[PDB]
Short mmCIF file of C-alpha atoms in Angstrom, two decimals:
data_model
loop_
_atom_site.label_atom_id
_atom_site.label_comp_id
_atom_site.label_asym_id
_atom_site.label_seq_id
_atom_site.Cartn_x
_atom_site.Cartn_y
_atom_site.Cartn_z
CA UNK A 1 42.36 128.79 174.45
CA UNK A 2 41.37 128.71 178.12
CA UNK A 3 43.69 128.67 181.13
CA UNK A 4 42.97 125.78 183.52
CA UNK A 5 41.01 128.02 185.81
CA UNK A 6 39.14 129.51 182.96
CA UNK A 7 38.38 125.85 182.07
CA UNK A 8 37.07 125.30 185.57
CA UNK A 9 34.74 128.24 185.14
CA UNK A 10 33.78 127.05 181.66
CA UNK A 11 32.77 123.58 182.76
CA UNK A 12 30.18 124.83 185.26
CA UNK A 13 28.37 127.02 182.74
CA UNK A 14 25.11 125.51 181.46
CA UNK A 15 24.23 125.29 177.82
CA UNK A 16 20.64 126.53 178.47
CA UNK A 17 19.44 128.70 181.38
CA UNK A 18 18.13 125.93 183.66
CA UNK A 19 19.67 122.94 182.00
CA UNK A 20 21.69 120.07 183.32
CA UNK A 21 24.16 120.06 180.40
CA UNK A 22 27.30 122.15 180.82
CA UNK A 23 30.04 123.50 178.58
CA UNK A 24 32.89 121.04 178.01
CA UNK A 25 36.31 121.05 176.39
CA UNK A 26 34.75 119.49 173.34
CA UNK A 27 32.81 122.73 172.70
CA UNK A 28 35.98 124.72 172.41
CA UNK A 29 37.60 122.17 169.99
CA UNK A 30 34.40 122.36 167.86
CA UNK A 31 34.30 126.17 167.90
CA UNK A 32 37.95 126.24 166.91
CA UNK A 33 37.44 123.81 163.95
CA UNK A 34 34.23 125.58 162.98
CA UNK A 35 36.10 128.89 162.76
CA UNK A 36 38.80 127.09 160.80
CA UNK A 37 36.08 125.96 158.39
CA UNK A 38 34.61 129.42 157.88
CA UNK A 39 38.24 130.57 157.29
CA UNK A 40 38.49 132.55 160.56
CA UNK A 41 41.64 132.41 162.64
CA UNK A 42 40.95 130.06 165.63
CA UNK A 43 43.93 131.41 167.54
CA UNK A 44 41.69 134.42 168.17
CA UNK A 45 39.66 132.26 170.67
CA UNK A 46 42.42 132.69 173.21
CA UNK A 47 41.90 136.31 174.22
CA UNK A 48 38.90 138.50 175.06
CA UNK A 49 39.72 140.80 172.15
CA UNK A 50 40.07 137.94 169.75
CA UNK A 51 36.63 136.69 170.78
CA UNK A 52 35.24 140.23 170.58
CA UNK A 53 36.55 140.40 166.99
CA UNK A 54 35.15 137.04 165.89
CA UNK A 55 31.73 137.94 167.35
CA UNK A 56 31.88 141.11 165.25
CA UNK A 57 32.58 139.22 162.04
CA UNK A 58 29.70 136.77 162.84
CA UNK A 59 27.27 139.28 164.29
CA UNK A 60 25.82 140.34 160.89
CA UNK A 61 25.08 136.76 159.82
CA UNK A 62 23.11 136.13 162.98
CA UNK A 63 19.73 137.19 161.59
CA UNK A 64 19.49 134.80 158.67
CA UNK A 65 21.79 132.42 160.48
CA UNK A 66 21.20 128.74 160.84
CA UNK A 67 21.37 127.27 164.36
CA UNK A 68 24.84 125.87 163.62
CA UNK A 69 26.06 129.45 163.25
CA UNK A 70 24.06 130.74 166.27
CA UNK A 71 25.47 127.83 168.24
CA UNK A 72 28.99 128.87 167.20
CA UNK A 73 28.36 132.54 168.00
CA UNK A 74 26.99 131.74 171.46
CA UNK A 75 29.84 129.40 172.36
CA UNK A 76 32.23 132.26 171.62
CA UNK A 77 30.05 134.69 173.63
CA UNK A 78 30.42 132.43 176.69
CA UNK A 79 34.18 132.12 176.10
CA UNK A 80 34.42 135.87 175.86
CA UNK A 81 32.71 136.39 179.20
CA UNK A 82 35.07 133.75 180.63
CA UNK A 83 38.22 135.52 179.34
CA UNK A 84 36.62 138.79 180.49
CA UNK A 85 36.04 137.40 183.98
CA UNK A 86 32.30 138.04 183.57
CA UNK A 87 30.31 135.66 185.72
CA UNK A 88 27.55 133.84 183.86
CA UNK A 89 25.38 130.89 184.84
CA UNK A 90 24.33 129.89 181.27
CA UNK A 91 24.68 131.05 177.61
CA UNK A 92 21.76 133.53 177.75
CA UNK A 93 23.39 135.39 180.69
CA UNK A 94 26.52 135.50 178.51
CA UNK A 95 24.63 137.19 175.68
CA UNK A 96 22.79 139.61 177.99
CA UNK A 97 26.04 140.47 179.75
CA UNK A 98 27.66 141.24 176.39
CA UNK A 99 24.73 143.31 175.15
CA UNK A 100 24.34 145.44 178.31
CA UNK A 101 28.10 145.86 177.92
CA UNK A 102 27.76 147.28 174.39
CA UNK A 103 24.72 149.42 175.23
CA UNK A 104 26.71 151.03 178.11
CA UNK A 105 29.77 151.85 175.96
CA UNK A 106 27.63 153.07 172.99
CA UNK A 107 26.10 155.59 175.38
CA UNK A 108 29.53 156.74 176.57
CA UNK A 109 30.17 157.16 172.82
CA UNK A 110 27.14 159.42 172.37
CA UNK A 111 28.23 161.16 175.61
CA UNK A 112 31.91 161.55 174.81
CA UNK A 113 30.58 162.70 171.43
CA UNK A 114 29.20 166.03 172.61
CA UNK A 115 32.53 167.21 174.06
CA UNK B 1 8.58 125.87 151.52
CA UNK B 2 5.73 125.70 148.96
CA UNK B 3 2.13 124.70 149.22
CA UNK B 4 0.84 122.71 146.23
CA UNK B 5 -0.59 125.10 143.66
CA UNK B 6 2.33 127.34 144.67
CA UNK B 7 4.34 124.28 143.66
CA UNK B 8 2.21 123.67 140.54
CA UNK B 9 3.36 127.02 139.19
CA UNK B 10 6.96 126.19 140.20
CA UNK B 11 7.00 122.98 138.19
CA UNK B 12 6.21 124.54 134.81
CA UNK B 13 8.80 127.36 135.10
CA UNK B 14 11.78 126.86 132.76
CA UNK B 15 15.45 126.99 133.82
CA UNK B 16 16.20 129.17 130.81
CA UNK B 17 14.63 132.42 129.64
CA UNK B 18 13.15 130.21 126.91
CA UNK B 19 14.29 126.58 127.18
CA UNK B 20 12.53 123.22 127.52
CA UNK B 21 13.57 122.13 131.03
CA UNK B 22 11.70 123.25 134.16
CA UNK B 23 11.73 123.67 137.93
CA UNK B 24 11.84 120.33 139.81
CA UNK B 25 10.94 119.70 143.42
CA UNK B 26 14.61 118.72 143.50
CA UNK B 27 15.79 122.39 143.17
CA UNK B 28 14.10 123.64 146.38
CA UNK B 29 15.71 120.79 148.31
CA UNK B 30 19.03 121.76 146.66
CA UNK B 31 18.45 125.38 147.59
CA UNK B 32 17.73 124.31 151.18
CA UNK B 33 20.88 122.21 151.52
CA UNK B 34 22.96 124.99 149.94
CA UNK B 35 21.74 127.51 152.50
CA UNK B 36 22.67 125.31 155.47
CA UNK B 37 25.94 124.65 153.65
CA UNK B 38 26.36 128.44 153.78
CA UNK B 39 25.16 128.37 157.46
CA UNK B 40 22.09 130.37 156.38
CA UNK B 41 18.63 129.47 157.71
CA UNK B 42 16.66 127.20 155.37
CA UNK B 43 13.30 127.92 156.93
CA UNK B 44 13.71 131.31 155.20
CA UNK B 45 12.62 129.78 151.87
CA UNK B 46 9.18 129.44 153.44
CA UNK B 47 8.31 133.11 153.39
CA UNK B 48 8.63 136.01 150.93
CA UNK B 49 10.37 138.33 153.36
CA UNK B 50 12.52 135.30 154.20
CA UNK B 51 13.61 134.81 150.57
CA UNK B 52 13.91 138.62 150.55
CA UNK B 53 16.41 138.53 153.38
CA UNK B 54 18.38 135.71 151.83
CA UNK B 55 18.67 137.41 148.46
CA UNK B 56 19.84 140.54 150.26
CA UNK B 57 22.45 138.53 152.09
CA UNK B 58 23.61 136.87 148.90
CA UNK B 59 23.39 139.86 146.55
CA UNK B 60 26.88 141.25 147.30
CA UNK B 61 28.79 137.96 146.70
CA UNK B 62 27.27 137.55 143.26
CA UNK B 63 29.42 139.49 140.84
CA UNK B 64 32.58 137.76 142.01
CA UNK B 65 30.36 134.80 142.77
CA UNK B 66 30.69 131.26 141.52
CA UNK B 67 28.19 129.40 139.31
CA UNK B 68 26.82 127.59 142.43
CA UNK B 69 26.28 130.87 144.21
CA UNK B 70 24.62 132.40 141.21
CA UNK B 71 22.55 129.31 140.71
CA UNK B 72 21.54 129.42 144.39
CA UNK B 73 20.65 133.12 143.98
CA UNK B 74 18.49 132.59 140.94
CA UNK B 75 16.23 129.85 142.26
CA UNK B 76 15.57 131.80 145.45
CA UNK B 77 14.78 134.67 143.07
CA UNK B 78 12.17 132.43 141.43
CA UNK B 79 10.92 131.00 144.80
CA UNK B 80 10.41 134.58 145.80
CA UNK B 81 8.23 135.52 142.79
CA UNK B 82 6.09 132.34 142.93
CA UNK B 83 5.84 132.98 146.68
CA UNK B 84 4.99 136.58 145.91
CA UNK B 85 2.24 135.55 143.42
CA UNK B 86 4.29 137.66 141.01
CA UNK B 87 4.43 135.05 138.33
CA UNK B 88 6.78 134.72 135.45
CA UNK B 89 7.72 132.19 132.74
CA UNK B 90 11.44 131.66 133.42
CA UNK B 91 14.24 132.77 135.77
CA UNK B 92 15.16 135.83 133.69
CA UNK B 93 11.66 137.21 134.21
CA UNK B 94 11.80 136.53 137.96
CA UNK B 95 15.15 138.37 137.91
CA UNK B 96 13.89 141.34 135.90
CA UNK B 97 10.91 141.22 138.21
CA UNK B 98 13.28 141.85 141.19
CA UNK B 99 15.50 144.32 139.30
CA UNK B 100 12.32 146.15 138.41
CA UNK B 101 10.54 145.93 141.80
CA UNK B 102 13.80 146.94 143.47
CA UNK B 103 13.78 150.02 141.31
CA UNK B 104 10.22 150.77 142.48
CA UNK B 105 11.78 150.66 146.00
CA UNK B 106 14.59 153.04 145.06
CA UNK B 107 12.44 155.55 143.17
CA UNK B 108 9.88 155.64 146.00
CA UNK B 109 12.34 155.52 148.96
CA UNK B 110 13.73 159.07 149.04
CA UNK C 1 45.11 131.80 134.60
CA UNK C 2 48.65 132.84 133.55
CA UNK C 3 50.14 132.90 130.05
CA UNK C 4 53.55 131.36 129.46
CA UNK C 5 55.40 134.64 129.80
CA UNK C 6 53.34 135.52 132.88
CA UNK C 7 54.18 132.02 134.14
CA UNK C 8 57.92 132.64 133.66
CA UNK C 9 57.51 135.92 135.51
CA UNK C 10 55.42 133.91 138.10
CA UNK C 11 57.77 131.00 138.67
CA UNK C 12 60.51 133.57 139.23
CA UNK C 13 58.77 135.30 142.20
CA UNK C 14 59.44 134.33 145.79
CA UNK C 15 57.03 133.77 148.68
CA UNK C 16 59.19 135.76 151.14
CA UNK C 17 61.71 138.58 150.53
CA UNK C 18 65.29 137.31 150.58
CA UNK C 19 63.61 133.94 150.22
CA UNK C 20 64.44 130.71 148.44
CA UNK C 21 61.08 129.23 147.42
CA UNK C 22 59.16 130.77 144.51
CA UNK C 23 55.68 130.47 143.11
CA UNK C 24 55.01 127.12 141.54
CA UNK C 25 52.20 125.94 139.33
CA UNK C 26 50.80 124.30 142.50
CA UNK C 27 49.87 127.73 143.87
CA UNK C 28 47.55 128.72 140.99
CA UNK C 29 45.79 125.35 141.25
CA UNK C 30 45.31 125.53 145.00
CA UNK C 31 43.91 129.07 144.71
CA UNK C 32 41.51 127.94 142.00
CA UNK C 33 40.31 125.03 144.14
CA UNK C 34 40.13 127.37 147.19
CA UNK C 35 37.92 129.91 145.38
CA UNK C 36 35.30 127.35 144.19
CA UNK C 37 35.17 126.22 147.88
CA UNK C 38 34.72 129.83 148.98
CA UNK C 39 31.97 129.88 146.27
CA UNK C 40 34.06 132.41 144.35
CA UNK C 41 34.44 132.20 140.60
CA UNK C 42 37.89 130.79 139.83
CA UNK C 43 37.74 132.24 136.29
CA UNK C 44 38.27 135.63 137.88
CA UNK C 45 41.91 134.59 138.52
CA UNK C 46 42.79 134.97 134.88
CA UNK C 47 42.16 138.67 134.77
CA UNK C 48 43.69 141.74 136.43
CA UNK C 49 40.20 143.09 137.15
CA UNK C 50 38.76 139.83 138.44
CA UNK C 51 41.80 139.30 140.66
CA UNK C 52 41.21 142.90 141.68
CA UNK C 53 37.55 142.22 142.53
CA UNK C 54 38.43 139.05 144.45
CA UNK C 55 40.98 140.93 146.58
CA UNK C 56 38.63 143.80 147.46
CA UNK C 57 36.11 141.18 148.56
CA UNK C 58 38.62 139.14 150.56
CA UNK C 59 40.24 142.18 152.17
CA UNK C 60 37.69 142.81 154.99
CA UNK C 61 38.11 139.20 156.15
CA UNK C 62 41.86 139.35 156.22
CA UNK C 63 42.36 140.79 159.67
CA UNK C 64 40.55 137.91 161.36
CA UNK C 65 41.23 135.42 158.57
CA UNK C 66 43.02 132.09 158.97
CA UNK C 67 46.38 131.36 157.34
CA UNK C 68 44.49 129.62 154.50
CA UNK C 69 42.70 132.85 153.63
CA UNK C 70 45.89 134.88 154.18
CA UNK C 71 47.63 132.60 151.72
CA UNK C 72 44.76 132.76 149.28
CA UNK C 73 44.89 136.53 149.40
CA UNK C 74 48.71 136.60 148.91
CA UNK C 75 48.79 134.31 145.86
CA UNK C 76 46.08 136.45 144.32
CA UNK C 77 47.90 139.64 145.32
CA UNK C 78 50.90 138.32 143.34
CA UNK C 79 48.66 137.10 140.46
CA UNK C 80 47.24 140.59 140.03
CA UNK C 81 50.64 142.23 139.84
CA UNK C 82 51.67 139.70 137.18
CA UNK C 83 48.44 140.36 135.17
CA UNK C 84 49.27 144.03 135.56
CA UNK C 85 52.83 143.56 134.42
CA UNK C 86 53.95 144.89 137.84
CA UNK C 87 57.52 143.89 138.66
CA UNK C 88 57.26 142.68 142.21
CA UNK C 89 60.18 140.60 143.41
CA UNK C 90 58.30 138.84 146.30
CA UNK C 91 54.89 138.67 148.03
CA UNK C 92 55.66 141.72 150.11
CA UNK C 93 55.90 144.02 147.09
CA UNK C 94 52.73 142.43 145.69
CA UNK C 95 50.74 143.34 148.81
CA UNK C 96 51.89 146.94 149.14
CA UNK C 97 50.83 147.33 145.49
CA UNK C 98 47.40 145.96 146.36
CA UNK C 99 47.62 148.38 149.35
CA UNK C 100 48.59 151.26 147.06
CA UNK C 101 45.65 150.83 144.62
CA UNK C 102 43.02 149.94 147.26
CA UNK C 103 43.53 153.33 148.92
CA UNK C 104 43.83 155.31 145.66
CA UNK C 105 40.28 154.29 144.75
CA UNK C 106 39.06 154.41 148.38
CA UNK C 107 40.19 158.03 148.60
CA UNK C 108 38.85 158.74 145.13
CA UNK C 109 35.26 157.45 145.41
CA UNK C 110 34.67 159.03 148.85
CA UNK C 111 36.35 162.47 148.90
CA UNK C 112 36.45 163.20 145.20
CA UNK C 113 33.27 161.32 144.51
#
């Protein structure tokens, strides 16, 4: 899933914005076997675009989603930023970074639109 | 999920349209554990809009849907009505009560 | 799910084109157990329409689906064809058939209706 080097980046990211706990290889194994459970292809965790796709399939369920699902989604958000080379200090910065990413492109959509 | 009173109602409602058996405490718990089985939020059973979001989430998987899914759908349907103080005597009523309130949404929406 | 003649047709189909292995009884059973797990009604498997409805539901998940889902969808693709008396030699022919119908009705109920 992660290059050693992505792993090194991963293992410094904190689970919560000021927390002492950090992401670990066990969180990737979990996320992979979780996706397996929900019949999503865990091989997808190995590229940015994979992760982008998974997040899109899970995005809709977020609202009514239990914290086991939100926990899965967020793990994959952090992974995505890691594959993307987007520097984050914790999970929330991951999610913000992804959002302000979408919001930028969806403007360029509106803006490419009137051409 | 339910206050007593709210739960008093619940416990006289019959599984069937017109059969003898009724709604246990045990069915809410089941409904809760089903939801987290489906990674859906169980705290949603605690509110009417909550049950209203769940039913909306579940409503497309229903036709093709298994007996457990349809069973989960129907008790959350009843939960909803009891929650909504829109009372009823069986599931079928609670279900017509959503088919027929949903139509009041559609006829008054556009 | 299948009737004897359907099951002769079935146990004569292969999983891959010039392939050796064909569809056993074990495949109908797995797919039935798989569907109940997916909270889908296994009794749908014994009709062309139900198989149809299961496939249209599964289809959006396919692209990011695991091999378990991909294999669930393929068995059911084949099962439909059989219920339809469509003469598909392997799974590949099964899935283009599913691909043929799924766009017929997609084009229909959007640009006709």
